[PDB]
Amino acid sequence: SDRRFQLLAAAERLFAERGFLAVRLEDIGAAAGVSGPAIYRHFPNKESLLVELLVGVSARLLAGARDVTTRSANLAAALDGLIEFHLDFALGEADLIRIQDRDLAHLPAVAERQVRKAQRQYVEVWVGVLRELNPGLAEADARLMAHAVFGLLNSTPHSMKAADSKPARTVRARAVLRAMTVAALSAADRCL
Amino acid sequence: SDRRFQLLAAAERLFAERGFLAVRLEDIGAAAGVSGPAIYRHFPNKESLLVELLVGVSARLLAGARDVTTRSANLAAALDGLIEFHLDFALGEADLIRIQDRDLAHLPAVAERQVRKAQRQYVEVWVGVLRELNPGLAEADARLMAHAVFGLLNSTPHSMKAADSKPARTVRARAVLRAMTVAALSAADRCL
User: Fold this and answer.
1) Is residue A106 within 8 Å of residue A20, measured between CB atoms?
2) Which of A6, A14, A103, B3 is least buried, going by the fewest C-beta atoms within 10 A?
3) Cβ contacts (< 8 Å) between A19 and chain B: which residues?
4) DSSP E strands, chain A
5) Does the B44-192 domain belong in CATH 1.10.357.10?
6) Chain A 58-97, residues with CB within 8 Å of chain B CB atoms
7) What is the spatial distance between Cα B63 and Cα A86, in angstroms, rounded to a whole number?
8) Looking at chain B, which residue has its C-alpha nearest residue A150?
9) What span, in angstroms and rounded, lies between the C-alpha atoms of A70 and A67?
């Protein structure tokens, strides 16, 4: 029916492999599996994809994270809920992490401000939960731990590349990273 | 005597705060503290600084990391040596990490290839040490562990920004980060 979402999918990958500037809109629809010039109806032109792609997913992850917090019985499980929830994003949507890391600056200034706002709030969602579990942590302490863990979790692009993606490797990748992050937050709490 | 290094120093800060593209060579020497056109003798023009800056430091960190391996009494101590050696770079040379994050693409093809070559080998130095400490782990495990740890350590620029640099905060950053990375690497050895 609607060839739009099929086209976004193609953009995500092509922006992930070769750079945003490297990728030309012409071969987005070609590699996508879509018609000729009917593409130039909803995604003229290139920058328009990047914005929906980044701004969209970023707004979700903030909502999705703030949901985990609301739905959690207590704080202990809220932290686990986040760890898992981010791990899902981290291992599943490994393309968007690379796009975050490179092509965030080739986003229109209005949308860039917007995406950064969401990231900041998403870190603050963690900080909130991380800091209420251990009130002896300062703001900057929670932040440090929060970015630390994300740094660790979002390091997957340097390991979970296209020539890989085997589900046996993914679940083992998940198993470890989880184990790493939980033990990293615990070491932090004890240190301070 | 020779105001080249003073010019290098200026560059690092200016490339870190404002983007590479945004930085004009004119105001590198201005904010640096140097003469007018005598600058245009050893660093014409802009791109030249970025290459010496990145290629120099990258090639050093490889050497420095490979030194830690050699001189260390045993393997367990070689890991602590590396963790501490990277912490030195991660927290101290915070500017470069932000430049490695963004403006690696605006390096000439020959230099970019060389900078990535060093990063790759620097990871392999860890891999080598991390894999001999636990031969139960396969290659792809020790890679994921290495990149995991670097993601955690190189998350500093999201906290230790220019509006700060109070040494009390850095020793705390160093203490937490080390504690987190050491606890994380063991969790990895256990889980798998």
Assistant:
1) yes
2) A6
3) 105
4) none
5) yes
6) none
7) 35
8) B152
9) 5
Question: Euclidean distance between the first and final Cα of chain A, in Å?
Answer: 56
Q: What is the DSSP string of B54-117?
A: HHHHHHHHHHHHHHHHHHSSSHHHHHHHHHHHHHIIIIISHHHHHHHHHTTTTS-HHHHHHHHH
Among residues A176, A136, A134, the alpha carbon closest in space to that of B191 is found at A176
Q: Are B114 and B55 in contact (CB under 8 A)?
A: yes
> How far is the C-alpha of A125 from the C-alpha of B82, rounded, in Å?
33
Q: Which two tokens stand for residue A190?
A: 């004890």
Q: Which of B20, B39, B16, B21 is nearest to B29 (CA)?
A: B39
Give the 3-state secondary structure of residue A35. coil
CA distance A84 to B101: 26
Measured distance CA(B45)–CA(B42) in Å, rounded: 9
**Cβ of A145 and B176 within 8 Å?**
yes
- Enter the tokens of residue A66: 């703030």
CA neighbor of B131 nearest in space, from B120, B123, B142: B142
Elucidation method? X-ray
**What resolution does the deposited structure have, in angstroms?**
3.4
A·B CB contacts under 8 A? 110
Residues of chain A with C-beta less than 8 angstroms from the C-beta of B153 = 151
What is the identity of the amino acid at A161?
K
What is the rounded CA–CA span in Å between residue A14 and residue A188?
A: 38
- Give which of B26, B3, A45 is closest to B14, Cα–Cα: B26
Q: Rounded to an integer, what is the distance from CA A187 to the centroid of its chain?
A: 25
What letter represents residue A113's amino acid? R
Q: How many CA atoms lie within 13 A of B160 on its CB side?
A: 27
Question: What six digits make up the tokens of A50?
Answer: 């990047």
In the CATH scheme, what is the code of domain B1-43?
A: 1.10.10.60
Q: How many residues does chain B have?
A: 192
Of the candidates B143, B155, B182, which has its C-beta nearest A151's C-beta? B155
Alpha carbon distance A106, A127 (integer Å): 29
Domain boundary assignment for chain B = 1-43, 44-192
* Closest CB to A169 among B105, B140, B179: B140
Is the Cβ of B127 closer than 8 Å to some Cβ of chain A? no
Question: Distance between CA atoms of B174 and B160, rounded to whole angstroms?
Answer: 11
Give phi and psi for A91, each to the nearest 5: -90, -35
